[PDB]
Amino acid sequence: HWGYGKHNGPEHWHKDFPIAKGERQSPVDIDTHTAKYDPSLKPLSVSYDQATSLRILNNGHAFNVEFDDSQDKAVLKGGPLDGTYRLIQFHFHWGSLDGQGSEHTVDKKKYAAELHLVHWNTKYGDFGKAVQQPDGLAVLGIFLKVGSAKPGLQKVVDVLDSIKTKGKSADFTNFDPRGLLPESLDYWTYPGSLTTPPLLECVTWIVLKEPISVSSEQVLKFRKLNFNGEGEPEELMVDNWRPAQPLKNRQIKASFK
Ligand SMILES: [Zn+2]
Numbered sequence: 001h002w003g004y005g006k007h008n009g010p011e012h013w014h015k016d017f018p019i020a021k022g023e024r025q026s027p028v029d030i031d032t033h034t035a036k037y038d039p040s041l042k043p044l045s046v047s048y049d050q051a052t053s054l055r056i057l058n059n060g061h062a063f064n065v066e067f068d069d070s071q072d073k074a075v076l077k078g079g080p081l082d083g084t085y086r087l088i089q090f091h092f093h094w095g096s097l098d099g100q101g102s103e104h105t106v107d108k109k110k111y112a113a114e115l116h117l118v119h120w121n122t123k124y125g126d127f128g129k130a131v132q133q134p135d136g137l138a139v140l141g142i143f144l145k146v147g148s149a150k151p152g153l154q155k156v157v158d159v160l161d162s163i164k165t166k167g168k169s170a171d172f173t174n175f176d177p178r179g180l181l182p183e184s185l186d187y188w189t190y191p192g193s194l195t196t197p198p199l200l201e202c203v204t205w206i207v208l209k210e211p212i213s214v215s216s217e218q219v220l221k222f223r224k225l226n227f228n229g230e231g232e233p234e235e236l237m238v239d240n241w242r243p244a245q246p247l248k249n250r251q252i253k254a255s256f257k
Contacts, residue, residue: 002016002017002196002197003060003061003227004061004227004239004240004241005235010242010243013197013199016197017197017198017199019193019198019199019200019201020197020199022193022199022201023201023248023249024191024192024193024201024248024250025192025193025199025201025245025246026103026104026192026193026194026195026203026205026242026245027102027103027104027105027114027192027195027242027243027244027245028104028190028192028244028245028246028247028250028252029104029105029106029107029108029244029247030104030105030106030107030188030207030252031107031252032106032107033107034252035188035251035252035253035254036251036252036253036254037253037254037255037256037257038253038254038255041079041080041189041253041255042078042079042080042255043078043079043185043255044076044077044078044079044140044185044187044206044255045075045076045077045078045079046076046140046178046181046185047074047075047076047077048074048087048176048177048178049178050073050074051067051073051074051087051175051176051177052067052068052073052074052173053065053066053067053172053173053174053175053177054066054067054068054171054172054173055169055170055171055172056156056159056163056169056170056172057163057167057168057169058163058164058165058166058167058168058169058225058226058237059166059167060166060167060227060228060229061196061227061240062091062092062093062237062240063091063092063160063163063225064089064090064091065089065090065091065156065172065175065177066088066089066172067087067088067089069086069087069088069120069127072084072086072122073086073087074086074087074177075087075119076117076119076138076140076206079187079189079206079255080189080204080206080253081138081204081206082135083121083122083123084121084122085119085120085121085122085137085138086119086120086122087117087118087119087177088118088119088120088127089118090115090116090117090118090177090180091115091116091118092113092114092115092116092144092222093113093114093116093195093240093241093242094112094113094114094144094219094222094223094238094239094240094241095110095112095113095238095239095241096223096236096238096239098112098146098216098219099112100112100239100241101113101114101144101239101241102114102143102144102241103141103195103241103242103243103244104141104143104205104207104244105244106143111143111144111145111211112144112145112146112214112219113143113144113214113219113222114141114142114143114144114241115141115142115143115144115180115212116139116140116141116195117139117140117141117142117177117180118137118139119137119138119139119140120136120137120138121133121135121136121137121138124136130202131194131198131200131202132200132202133202134191134201134202135202135204136202136203137194137202137203137204138203138204138206139203139204139205139206140206140208141205141206141207141208142180142181142182142207142208142211142212143207143208143211143212144211144212144213144214144219145211145212145213145214146213146214146215146216146219147213147214147215148213148214148215149213149214149215149217149218150179150180150212150213150214150215150218151179152176152178152179152180153179153180153214153218154218155175156175157218157221157222159172160221160222160224160225161224163225164224164225164226164230165226165228165229165230165232166226166227166228166229167229167230168230180212181208181212182208182210182211182212183210184208184209184210185208185255186208186209186210186254186255186256187206187207187208187209187254187255187256188205188206188207188209188252188253188254188255189204189205189206189207189252189253189255190205190250190251190252190253191203191204191205191250192205192250195242196242209256222237223236223237223238224236225237227240
């Protein structure tokens with residue numbers, strides 16, 4: 001019964017998931033004055049031309065746009081990564097107000113929302129085995145600010161009414177996730193965790209420096225989603241973000257000077 005409410009939010013998660021107080025928890029604050037350029041990094045390779053989206057699902061915590069991950073169709077490689085990571089889903093975290101909603105922060109700045117493109121390392125055969133490994137996942141994180149509309153997000157926004165409540169899903173084929181990326185692929189990277197229970201420490205984070213802009217109308221439609229199931233009291237799906245966690249014995253590396 002974890003969530004983001006008044007009595008089950010992030011500060012309670014440790015009771016059922018003790019790794020919430022672990023050594024490699026996410027998100028973190030990205031201090032641009034201490035992150036160091038790493039010349040050993042590569043450019044990222046984002047290969048989404050063959051991506052096959054399937055479905056969108058309201059899981060009661062966010063919504064996931066799900067992909068066919070049974071072949072190397074949409075993969076992330078390069079950067080800090082060894083091997084090939086397949087896109088399984090993306091989702092967002094967002095606020096009730098434009099001044100909060102992101103999970104990572106940059107010099108303590110909160111963005112309006114954050115996009116997570118979740119990928120798993122093909123050497124481990126399936127997602128569920130990957131999350132048991134320190135290098136099982138690679139999550140591409142992208143900040144959202146409110147400004148101009150993002151055209152490539154509109155198809156997502158216009159299906160949200162069909163998945164208002166927990167447990168609803170809808171067909172979601174032929175969505176191109178390239179329409180969610182900013183121009184630059186400059187990034188910060190560090191080792192961390194899933195940001196929801198079970199909070200497993202299996203993630204290579206790759207957080208893009210350049211945010212994307214979404215419109216106030218787009219964000220407002222996200223804020224009409226519900227945490228609750230149909231026929232239950234309405235609880236708006238807002239403020240579904242975990243705050244920054246202690247960096248501990250980690251370094252954040254930058255791909256750019
Ligand atoms: Zn996430």
